[PDB]
């Protein structure tokens, strides 16, 4: 689990969104596994606006932050899970790192701010949904 709190927005994995998220919806995209809802309180996270390929992510199944190298956002084939059939997921970045299903939502960040959130994984890989192209999160 986990979210990004920027301005009056909450960014979560679409497959983990709550009823309150759906009832206060701003934007969602199943191909990216992202959903954004509105918040009453202002958040403290800032979004990175860069092309970094190195950063650090939070892994809840280890209680640890790990440094990683990650690919550029791309269209990647992801195996079937309990939330989606096997399909192509867009704007996804891959790295070598530990992950488990409940690690979705952990933040990936670089020197500039939040880059994305954990969205996929398996066998020593972790995948992150990028948010750096969503410029509207800043206004
Ligand atoms: C951190 S995810 C993970 C990690 C290790 C092993 C398996 C997973 C689960 C996963 O990849 N899922 C979960 C739901 C939505 C995704 O498209 C598919
Ligand atoms: Zn950066």
Reported resolution, Å: 1.2
Same-domain check for residues 102 and 124: yes
Nearest-5° Cα angle at 124, 123 to 127: 95
Structure tokens at 21: 């998220």
Q: Which residue has the tokens 């809840």?
A: 60
117 lines ligand 1 (CB under 6 A): no
Is residue 104 part of the annotated active site? The answer reads yes
Q: What separation in angstroms does the CA of 58 have from each of 7, 97, 98, 103? A: 21, 10, 10, 8
- Collapse the DSSP code of 137 into the 3-class scheme (helix H, G, I; strand E, B; otherwise coil) and give the result: helix
Is residue 138 part of the annotated active site? The answer reads no
Contact 132, 48 (CB under 8 A): yes
Nearest-5° Cα angle at 109, 7 to 39: 20
Same-domain check for residues 61 and 93: yes
DSSP 8-class letter at 22:
H
Q: Which domain holds residue 123?
A: 45-139
From the list 60, 53, 41, the residue with the least C-alpha distance to 116 is 53
Same-domain check for residues 29 and 58: no
φ, ψ of residue 31 in degrees (nearest 5): -65, -25
- State the method: X-ray
Same-domain check for residues 107 and 124: yes
Contact 75, 88 (CB under 8 A): yes
The domain tally of the chain equals: 2
Same-domain check for residues 54 and 39: no
Give the CA dihedral 127, 38, 23, 36, nearest 10 degrees: -20
Active-site hit among 21, 59, 103, 104: 104
Same-domain check for residues 139 and 107: yes
Instruction: Output the CA torsion sign for 66, 7, 73, 61.
Output: positive
Contact 66, 56 (CB under 8 A): yes
Which residues in 33-103 belong to E strands, given as ranges? 34-44, 54-59, 64-69, 74-78, 87-96
Of the listed ligands, the closest to the CA of 56 is 2
> Distance between CA 131 and CA 134 in Å, rounded?
6
Same-domain check for residues 109 and 139: yes
Element (H, E) at 51: none
Same-domain check for residues 51 and 8: no
Q: What is the per-residue DSSP string for 29-47?
A: EGGGTEEEEEEEEEEE--B
């Amino acid at each position: 689990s986990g979210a990004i709190y920027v301005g009056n927005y909450r960014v979560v994995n679409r497959h983990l969104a709550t009823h309150n998220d759906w009832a206060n919806l701003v934007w969602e995209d199943s191909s990216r596994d992202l959903l954004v809802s509105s918040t009453t309180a202002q958040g403290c996270d800032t979004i990175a606006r860069c092309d970094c390929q190195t950063g650090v992510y939070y892994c809840s199944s280890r209680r640890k932050h790990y440094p990683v190298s990650f690919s550029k956002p791309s269209l990647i084939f992801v195996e079937a899970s309990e939330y989606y059939p096997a399909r192509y997921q867009s704007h996804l970045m891959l790295a070598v790192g530990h992950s488990e299903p409940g690690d979705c939502g952990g933040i990936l960040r670089c020197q500039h701010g939040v880059v994305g959130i954990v969205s996929t994984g398996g066998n020593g890989l972790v995948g992150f949904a990028d948010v750096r192209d969503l410029l509207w999160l800043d206004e």
